[PDB]
Amino acid sequence: EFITVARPYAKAAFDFAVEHQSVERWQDMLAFAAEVTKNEQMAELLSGALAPETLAESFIAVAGEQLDENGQNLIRVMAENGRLNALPDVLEQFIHLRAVSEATAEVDVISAAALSEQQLAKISAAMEKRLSRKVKLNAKIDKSVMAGVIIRAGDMVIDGSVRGRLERLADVL
Amino acid sequence: QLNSTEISELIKQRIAQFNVVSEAHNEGTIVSVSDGVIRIHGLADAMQGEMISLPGNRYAIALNLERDSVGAVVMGPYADLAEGMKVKATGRILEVPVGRGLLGRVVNTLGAPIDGKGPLDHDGFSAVEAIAPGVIERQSVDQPVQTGYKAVDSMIPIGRGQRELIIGDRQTGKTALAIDAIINQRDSGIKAIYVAIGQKASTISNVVRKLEEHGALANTIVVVATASESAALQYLAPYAGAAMGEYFRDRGEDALIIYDDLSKQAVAYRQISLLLRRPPGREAFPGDVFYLHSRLLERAARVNAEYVEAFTKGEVKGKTGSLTALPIIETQAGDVSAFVPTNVISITDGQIFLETNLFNAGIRPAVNPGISVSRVGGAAQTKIMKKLSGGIRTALAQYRELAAFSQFASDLDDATRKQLDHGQKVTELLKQKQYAPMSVAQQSLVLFAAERGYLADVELSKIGSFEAALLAYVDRDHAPLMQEINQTGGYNDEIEGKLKGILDSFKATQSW
Amino acid sequence: QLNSTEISELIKQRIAQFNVVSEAHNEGTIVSVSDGVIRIHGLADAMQGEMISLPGNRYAIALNLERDSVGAV
Amino acid sequence: SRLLERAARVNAEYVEAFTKGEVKGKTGSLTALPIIETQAGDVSAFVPTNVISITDGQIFLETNLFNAGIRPAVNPGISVSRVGGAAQTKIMKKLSGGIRTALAQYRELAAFSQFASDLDDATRKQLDHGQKVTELLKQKQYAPMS
Amino acid sequence: MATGKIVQVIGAVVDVEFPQDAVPRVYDALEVQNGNERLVLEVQQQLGGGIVRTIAMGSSDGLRRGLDVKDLEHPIEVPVGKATLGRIMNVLGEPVDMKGEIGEEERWAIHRAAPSYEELSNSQELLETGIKVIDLMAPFAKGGKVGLFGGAGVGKTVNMMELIRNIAIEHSGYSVFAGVGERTREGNDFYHEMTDSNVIDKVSLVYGQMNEPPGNRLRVALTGLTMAEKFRDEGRDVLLFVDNIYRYTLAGTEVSALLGRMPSAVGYQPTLAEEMGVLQERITSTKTGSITSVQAVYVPADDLTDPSPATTFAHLDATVVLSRQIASLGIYPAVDPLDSTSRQLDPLVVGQEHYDTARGVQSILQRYQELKDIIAILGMDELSEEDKLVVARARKIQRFLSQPFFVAEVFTGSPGKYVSLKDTIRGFKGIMEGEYDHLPEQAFYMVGSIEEAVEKAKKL
Amino acid sequence: MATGKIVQVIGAVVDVEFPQDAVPRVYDALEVQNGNERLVLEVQQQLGGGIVRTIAMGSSDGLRRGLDVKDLEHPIEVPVGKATLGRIMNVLGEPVDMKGEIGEEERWAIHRAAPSYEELSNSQELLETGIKVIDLMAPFAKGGKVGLFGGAGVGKTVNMMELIRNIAIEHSGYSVFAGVGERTREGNDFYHEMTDSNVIDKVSLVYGQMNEPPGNRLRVALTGLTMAEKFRDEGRDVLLFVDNIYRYTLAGTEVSALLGRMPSAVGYQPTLAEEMGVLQERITSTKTGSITSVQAVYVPADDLTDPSPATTFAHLDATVVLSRQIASLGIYPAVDPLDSTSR
Amino acid sequence: TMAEKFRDEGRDVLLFVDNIYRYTLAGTEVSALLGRMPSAVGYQPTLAEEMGVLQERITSTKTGSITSVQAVYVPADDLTDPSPATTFAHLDATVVLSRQIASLGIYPAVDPLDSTSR
Amino acid sequence: AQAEIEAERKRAREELRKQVAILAVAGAEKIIERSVDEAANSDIVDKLV
Amino acid sequence: AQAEIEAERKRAREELRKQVAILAVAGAEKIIERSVDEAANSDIVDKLV
Numbered sequence A: 001e002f003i004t005v006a007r008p009y010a011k012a013a014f015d016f017a018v019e020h021q022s023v024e025r026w027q028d029m030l031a032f033a034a035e036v037t038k039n040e041q042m043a044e045l046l047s048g049a050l051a052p053e054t055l056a057e058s059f060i061a062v063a064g065e066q067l068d069e070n071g072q073n074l075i076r077v078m079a080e081n082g083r084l085n086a087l088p089d090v091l092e093q094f095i096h097l098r099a100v101s102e103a104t105a106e107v108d109v110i111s112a113a114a115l116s117e118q119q120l121a122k123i124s125a126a127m128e129k130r131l132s133r134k135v136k137l138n139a140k141i142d143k144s145v146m147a148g149v150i151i152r153a154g155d156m157v158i159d160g161s162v163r164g165r166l167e168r169l170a171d172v173l
Numbered sequence B: 001q002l003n004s005t006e007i008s009e010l011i012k013q014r015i016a017q018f019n020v021v022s023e024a025h026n027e028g029t030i031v032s033v034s035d036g037v038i039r040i041h042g043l044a045d046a047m048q049g050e051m052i053s054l055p056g057n058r059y060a061i062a063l064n065l066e067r068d069s070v071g072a073v074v075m076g077p078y079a080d081l082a083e084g085m086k087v088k089a090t091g092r093i094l095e096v097p098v099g100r101g102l103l104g105r106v107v108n109t110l111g112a113p114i115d116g117k118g119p120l121d122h123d124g125f126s127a128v129e130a131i132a133p134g135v136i137e138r139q140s141v142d143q144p145v146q147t148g149y150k151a152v153d154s155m156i157p158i159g160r161g162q163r164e165l166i167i168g169d170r171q172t173g174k175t176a177l178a179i180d181a182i183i184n185q186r187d188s189g190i191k192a193i194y195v196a197i198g199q200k201a202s203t204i205s206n207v208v209r210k211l212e213e214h215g216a217l218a219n220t221i222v223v224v225a226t227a228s229e230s231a232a233l234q235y236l237a238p239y240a241g242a243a244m245g246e247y248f249r250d251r252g253e254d255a256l257i258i259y260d261d262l263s264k265q266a267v268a269y270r271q272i273s274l275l276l277r278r279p280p281g282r283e284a285f286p287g288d289v290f291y292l293h294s295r296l297l298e299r300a301a302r303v304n305a306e307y308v309e310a311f312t313k314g315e316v317k318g319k320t321g322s323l324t325a326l327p328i329i330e331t332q333a334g335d336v337s338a339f340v341p342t343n344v345i346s347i348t349d350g351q352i353f354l355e356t357n358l359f360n361a362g363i364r365p366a367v368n369p370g371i372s373v374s375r376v377g378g379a380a381q382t383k384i385m386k387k388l389s390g391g392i393r394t395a396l397a398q399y400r401e402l403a404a405f406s407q408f409a410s411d412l413d414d415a416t417r418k419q420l421d422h423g424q425k426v427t428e429l430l431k432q433k434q435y436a437p438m439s440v441a442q443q444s445l446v447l448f449a450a451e452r453g454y455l456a457d458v459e460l461s462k463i464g465s466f467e468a469a470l471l472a473y474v475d476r477d478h479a480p481l482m483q484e485i486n487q488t489g490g491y492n493d494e495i496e497g498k499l500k501g502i503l504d505s506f507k508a509t510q511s512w
Numbered sequence C: 001q002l003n004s005t006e007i008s009e010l011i012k013q014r015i016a017q018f019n020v021v022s023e024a025h026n027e028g029t030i031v032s033v034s035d036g037v038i039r040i041h042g043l044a045d046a047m048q049g050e051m052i053s054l055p056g057n058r059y060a061i062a063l064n065l066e067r068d069s070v071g072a073v
Numbered sequence D: 001s002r003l004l005e006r007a008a009r010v011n012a013e014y015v016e017a018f019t020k021g022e023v024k025g026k027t028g029s030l031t032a033l034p035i036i037e038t039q040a041g042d043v044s045a046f047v048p049t050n051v052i053s054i055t056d057g058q059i060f061l062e063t064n065l066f067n068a069g070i071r072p073a074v075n076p077g078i079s080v081s082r083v084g085g086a087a088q089t090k091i092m093k094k095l096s097g098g099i100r101t102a103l104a105q106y107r108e109l110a111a112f113s114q115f116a117s118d119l120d121d122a123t124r125k126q127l128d129h130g131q132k133v134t135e136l137l138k139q140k141q142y143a144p145m146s
Numbered sequence E: 001m002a003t004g005k006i007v008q009v010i011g012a013v014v015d016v017e018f019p020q021d022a023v024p025r026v027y028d029a030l031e032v033q034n035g036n037e038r039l040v041l042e043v044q045q046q047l048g049g050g051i052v053r054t055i056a057m058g059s060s061d062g063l064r065r066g067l068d069v070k071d072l073e074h075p076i077e078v079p080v081g082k083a084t085l086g087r088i089m090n091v092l093g094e095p096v097d098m099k100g101e102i103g104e105e106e107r108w109a110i111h112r113a114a115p116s117y118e119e120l121s122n123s124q125e126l127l128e129t130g131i132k133v134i135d136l137m138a139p140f141a142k143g144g145k146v147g148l149f150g151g152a153g154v155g156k157t158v159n160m161m162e163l164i165r166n167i168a169i170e171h172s173g174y175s176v177f178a179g180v181g182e183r184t185r186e187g188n189d190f191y192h193e194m195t196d197s198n199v200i201d202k203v204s205l206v207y208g209q210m211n212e213p214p215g216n217r218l219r220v221a222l223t224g225l226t227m228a229e230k231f232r233d234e235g236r237d238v239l240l241f242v243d244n245i246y247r248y249t250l251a252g253t254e255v256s257a258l259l260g261r262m263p264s265a266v267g268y269q270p271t272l273a274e275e276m277g278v279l280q281e282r283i284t285s286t287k288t289g290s291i292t293s294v295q296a297v298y299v300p301a302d303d304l305t306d307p308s309p310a311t312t313f314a315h316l317d318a319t320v321v322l323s324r325q326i327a328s329l330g331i332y333p334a335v336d337p338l339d340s341t342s343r344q345l346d347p348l349v350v351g352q353e354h355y356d357t358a359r360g361v362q363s364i365l366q367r368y369q370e371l372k373d374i375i376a377i378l379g380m381d382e383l384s385e386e387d388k389l390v391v392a393r394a395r396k397i398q399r400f401l402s403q404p405f406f407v408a409e410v411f412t413g414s415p416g417k418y419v420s421l422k423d424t425i426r427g428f429k430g431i432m433e434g435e436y437d438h439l440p441e442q443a444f445y446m447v448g449s450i451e452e453a454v455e456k457a458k459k460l
Numbered sequence F: 001m002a003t004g005k006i007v008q009v010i011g012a013v014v015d016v017e018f019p020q021d022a023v024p025r026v027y028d029a030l031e032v033q034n035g036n037e038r039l040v041l042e043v044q045q046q047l048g049g050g051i052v053r054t055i056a057m058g059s060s061d062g063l064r065r066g067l068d069v070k071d072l073e074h075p076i077e078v079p080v081g082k083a084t085l086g087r088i089m090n091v092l093g094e095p096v097d098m099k100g101e102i103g104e105e106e107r108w109a110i111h112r113a114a115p116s117y118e119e120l121s122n123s124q125e126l127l128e129t130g131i132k133v134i135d136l137m138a139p140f141a142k143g144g145k146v147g148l149f150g151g152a153g154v155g156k157t158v159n160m161m162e163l164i165r166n167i168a169i170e171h172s173g174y175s176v177f178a179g180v181g182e183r184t185r186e187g188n189d190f191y192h193e194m195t196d197s198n199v200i201d202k203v204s205l206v207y208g209q210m211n212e213p214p215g216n217r218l219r220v221a222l223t224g225l226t227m228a229e230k231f232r233d234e235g236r237d238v239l240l241f242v243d244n245i246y247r248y249t250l251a252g253t254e255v256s257a258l259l260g261r262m263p264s265a266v267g268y269q270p271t272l273a274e275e276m277g278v279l280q281e282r283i284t285s286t287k288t289g290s291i292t293s294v295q296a297v298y299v300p301a302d303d304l305t306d307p308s309p310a311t312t313f314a315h316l317d318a319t320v321v322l323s324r325q326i327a328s329l330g331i332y333p334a335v336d337p338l339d340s341t342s343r
Numbered sequence G: 001t002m003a004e005k006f007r008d009e010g011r012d013v014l015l016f017v018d019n020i021y022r023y024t025l026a027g028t029e030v031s032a033l034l035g036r037m038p039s040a041v042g043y044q045p046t047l048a049e050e051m052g053v054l055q056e057r058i059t060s061t062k063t064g065s066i067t068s069v070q071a072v073y074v075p076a077d078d079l080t081d082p083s084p085a086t087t088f089a090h091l092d093a094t095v096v097l098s099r100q101i102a103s104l105g106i107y108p109a110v111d112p113l114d115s116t117s118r
Numbered sequence H, I: 001a002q003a004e005i006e007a008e009r010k011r012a013r014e015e016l017r018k019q020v021a022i023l024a025v026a027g028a029e030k031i032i033e034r035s036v037d038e039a040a041n042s043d044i045v046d047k048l049v
């Protein structure tokens, strides 16, 4: 795992994208590179001890949909350091940074069944009061909850599932 | 137990009092598990020294707050943990229960009772890693702690707020001397604490049976981290014991604490340190192993009346609080100059050096004069003991060197022949049986008998029977004097004459 | 997995144009300072044993010409 | 260890099964004599510790004896064989016990040797007997004895 | 179904990658086909995401990356009970005596928690070994631990063989022998000595040989402990023989160095004292039964100060000290009577008669050790007439506490003798008091009870 | 305005991240709100990317990641001058007595360079201490270093008190007592014995004792020294007592290990002889005043070759040995005249 | 190499090497920079191979003979330092000088209790 | 005392088999905000012993 | 002896209570799983939100 190596590159890419008003394009560009990083043949090439320069050129070629500023520079700098396998994380970090500056939170909700869209809108407005961000709910239908909902807002979690209450009662006994 | 309605009403009360609502909590995932250390991902608001709650009603202590993970040590069996389990951050820096209510109960490092007798009744919690009283908040040590051993109480007086190192090779009566000090504390204001670090469970079972048998258990807290428990529990135990003792210290009472094998705490801290990749030092012990023992032992202190008055917010006025520590250190072949021994000797205010070749020769307790000292000294000692005992230590050391010379010199001067007899009798007199603590009056009159020559005819032999008969005679007739001596400890020419009259009457009229 | 003295705004400068060697080879920037040892970034023109001039009136001795940085005292 | 544990005596059934007949009754054997070099006679080193732990016995050759002229400079009593007499002809096994006791007594009474003519004649007869046994063990290279 | 794939092999250490949902917990046993052989792996660490770091129990040769790994969702688990008696097994509980399958009824995992201090049973019932010097100078109770300290070649292994025989056809209780770091020659000699002496049917043998990977040698002590704990649960008073603790600590050092843990004081592993505690804390008596134990401890280079013997001393209740000087004199067992000790040697548990006999023997031998140099310089005819008697009585004591073992017969041809504690006390108490001042010294050498001494003198 | 963020906490070592341009310098002091109490961090290294590695002058427990850190633009600063006489302070220049507050007019940074070569006094002079044994067998150079080697019970404290008295009454100087890495009991009883002798009015005390985190035990000696330097600038002759310099060395070793530097000859830090010289070079005579120093020294394992004694003895000008035999003879001061030495 | 050329011409040659230890020391100085983990007392892992690759080719053959005298410095007078200890096996006659005997002034300061020959 | 407590537990266990029927409904009705469905008893008695 | 018999009485009472707890909470789990409706689930969610 290489969160720690991806942090500098993500921060540099984002801090550059706001100097040139193209965060939205950079995100899709990094997502394209992160997908090319996963291929079975390309992952065999990245493991191979080619010279950083020719390995970078062998990586530029498979992605022409890329700015001069973005691909031909970021990919080369990451190749000189041998960091290209970090791209899937440089993406996620980038997204996160964006969500930070845009004052947004990707709250996740989990339930045994669909919510009434009044429950869910109340959840949105209430989390937006609990936090200080525009929330973006996404639901999951997990049956083991059976009733109630889990609201996860990053490291904070609120558990109202009947299974959670049952197992807590199990440990009050 | 036929009243199963008791079981149904217990369960009904548990169901009724169950709180149905839920609250927000901060949560992380276990990413790695090895050798007792876990790495946690998440817990942005974890704080260094916090208690993290694992699935299974046990805790880990967050020691490393790295940039993207929390390195914590599990307090208990780790092996069932796995990557992907989720942990919750408690808002608490490492706590332990404290108070009178756990006085007389057996608990582990986290204050959970391993005694079986139900839950504790503490009052509040105390932070384990606390800070000692400052330079201006302390007071001089000038009150006695009696260990009940003639050798220590005469030669090496211990004061309330002193730190005396019990140091010696393996199997020389260190644990015995410590638990006999605890048992003596029964019927004194001093509350006792025994912290066993790395001890095998059979030793702890024996210790608790002997504490309850001699009735000392109702006075004392027993803190257990057995040889098989995780090193985190062994490393962090003495600090829990120190907090439980400091509760009493801060209220203007007296406590005494024994740390059994601080050398095993240093080994457990070395293990936990190396497992976190921290750089090593002189013998692989981490760099701050001194600051491990120091910041523990400096909490043992006597605090002045203004400190306890301000701490307790005016509820106690005249009292001075104290906590007395007796750390135990195990040396190898008596090399005092080892690393951890010479650190702890540089920390404490004295040492009771126990010599193995005296112990095997039946000299029990095997305290070695000369090399053992109390730097607080006679200020702690009671006046009668200070008067009687002044010579005994130097007399014994010079007797030992003279008796070393003697083996090569038969047919020797008749002047040294008497010093070398009187030393051999005093060295024979100062040993005593395993669980027999002796009060200040009993020790005082035995030492008066030894110092004022009343032995020299009985100097033959059977001096043990003489000592037992003398105690039983004085207990039969002159108990009002034993009472005066035990209550006041004072010494007068009138008391000197009384003691002369006692030994004159004993020697003429009784047998042994 | 460890970093190698490549940091956010230097990566950003390389992002602006990869061939930053179009700038002067004559100078660089301090990147770290620890116990009298210094790490410098840039100085493509530096040669081992060279006197490097610091702000104020001070000198450092270039001991290491590594892949991307100069180590000096 | 997995090198040295390959030196073994093997019973007749293993030989008969391995060779699929063609040999019967006979036992196979491989005997290993590893050599180790120590730095200034220290045994507490790593590789000496391992190999001393693995093998069935040790022959300790010492330079203080070799210089004095005791060649081969085997140091008895510090040197052990855990096989003992089981690997000796019964004549050797019979005769060796008095050699062992004579050298053990010589080693115990060795200290007094620097003050020989302070001693009693009874111990003196043991001291100068142990010297004569030590002198008798000395032997020239390339002259094996039957 | 198998779901892991091998991703590294470096010596005995193998890394296996699993799907993020199914990662094996610590100490789980994985299984892989090393060609036609079946290799199990023990999970040591969960490092990183989905990767698992393991030690191979069999040899690691022939493994290749990408092999499929099946995870058995249990730790290494072994057969236990009566079915084990008189079999030889390895660490995995697989037979190696070629007598076919074990024919088990139950299996237990080798990793488990020790008894709590509340479950322990305080006991003082002394064991009665057949050995004079050990019964007299170092008595030990049920549930206690005994360490046979000494160098190489002093008789630890044959002393343990004698103990197994005496506590298997005099007192008919079961026994378990865990040979950690065994020498195959000595293990075969042990197997044939026990099969020839008819005791094989009351001993359960586990061997981890010296030519096996480190963790395979390490786990074996836990396998033998797990069998002794099964026999304890049935109410027996079992006796567990550990053939060398020093090689257990060495196997721990090796395993810890392979995993790349940072080493300790003398290169030993950091976990040294916790491994020793996890081993020795399971060996205790309980309210239902008891495990007594005797452990051979090799002291390297003749110092009791390095971490291994220094760390095992904390757990023993009795320590016997063997010396090659006494053995080279020709006295067996070569116990040093002055340096061997016990926690249970005090009047309150052994009685005043036993305590006084032991202290008198030690005093006589100490006085003789004093007189030895006066005898050497002056000669014996200068000693005083009471010292000329201490000399003879000490010399006869020093003979009488040698003894012929039943298992040493193949070394000496003479038959062995079993001596009750009553006869031992009676003999020493008689000798010290001068009842046998008329017998030669050689009348006491290599005899059983004092009756054999008087009868040999009558023959001599 | 706070500008930094805590990024790591590992024991007493704290890493904090600043904007790329606002990075603190090497010995600057930062501070944090650790709950209610403020905590001071002393920077030790500048790592790449704005990260700065510091050591906490206090208890590290309770620190979260992401806490706001405020960058003070100067090193640790302590009060100096007459105002500090008779008080007790810790490393940070805060009263740990309870007499209230220090009315100092001025504050000085504890870090600075030693006197320049042209600034040293072009003369050599003796210090008349007034004690026969010391004045005869081991004279004091004005501006020299002196070692005290005796044990306990030998009257060391009474020697220090007599020196404190004489340097004030007969001469016209003051004194600073820096107790680094020693028992709290002894500092408490020493304070009581100095106030029971009317010398407390003439000495300024600074304490970092054994119960203190490593950074306090490291920097307390520099706090004491920078007060002695403020007395020097006023034109006086000053005495500086260091209650155990071996503990200054040992706390430097602990901090070095915490920072992760490679171990030197016997495990000591690689910077030992520099860390020692940076202290001992400020104790010199100058052509405005002078600081003389009396330093209690402890020799590990009684080894005069160990790197710590070997580095300390390079600086000492005189050496006074205290012996219990001379005290058993009832002779005070118990100075051993045969081993006492002065160059 | 020059000694080997004179050997292959069929001659017999004298080779004097004035301090062989410096060859291994220069290898130690370089070794860490080449990225090789240090060994027993700092020396390169390849100490014994680096020494044997030089020492084994300075030998007499059936076409010619090389007689050679090597000085072998021993650091800190420690005869058990890895470099002396691994050098001793290569030679045929080893003369061991000692500082104690030289302090007597008895030159040549040979220790006769340590010097030997094949 | 061992034989006394053994028969005391044996007697208790039968009555606890009655009590557990009630207590399982108590534990269900406590944690959902509209109370549990009547005559669902067949599944509870399938759990009960 | 009486104190040890009291310890065994505590042990047996706790073991029985634990067995009935485990059975009762599994029973409550199966009751709640069968005995549910959307009006109760909505009511639970509306108490949460």
Ligand SMILES: Nc1ncnc2c1ncn2[C@@H]1O[C@H](COP(=O)(O)OP(=O)(O)OP(=O)(O)O)[C@@H](O)[C@H]1O
Pocket: B169, B170, B171, B172, B173, B174, B175, B176, B177, B330, B364, B365, B432, B433, B434, E314, E343, E344
């Ligand atoms: N005063 C005494 N009289 C008689 N026996 C004693 C006395 N003191 C100790 N013993 C006995 O000596 C043995 C060792 O005592 P103890 O357990 O205190 O030693 P230890 O040094 O604490 O042991 P270890 O160092 O192994 O932990 C015990 O069997 C104890 O009963």
Ligand SMILES: Nc1ncnc2c1ncn2[C@@H]1O[C@H](COP(=O)(O)OP(=O)(O)O)[C@@H](O)[C@H]1O
Pocket: D081, D082, D083, D084, D085, E151, E152, E153, E154, E155, E156, E157, E158, E159, E332, E333, E405, E408, E411, E412
């Ligand atoms: N009682 C005895 N009688 C005869 N020989 C013995 C006796 N005890 C030990 N030995 C000899 O010692 C040798 C090895 O003893 P062993 O028990 O293996 O020592 P260690 O403790 O080193 O394993 C055996 O070959 C045997 O000949």
Ligand SMILES: Nc1ncnc2c1ncn2[C@@H]1O[C@H](COP(=O)(O)OP(=O)(O)O)[C@@H](O)[C@H]1O
Pocket: F151, F152, F153, F154, F155, F156, F157, F158, F159, F332, F333
């Ligand atoms: N100059 C002196 N005159 C008389 N007595 C002295 C003198 N110096 C020391 N002493 C005696 O020696 C004792 C030593 O005690 P103390 O000073 O506390 O030792 P330390 O300071 O080394 O702990 C003093 O209490 C005092 O009794």
Ligand SMILES: [Mg+2]
Pocket: B171, B174, B175, B176
């Ligand atoms: Mg003990």
Ligand SMILES: [Mg+2]
Pocket: E156, E157
């Ligand atoms: Mg053996």
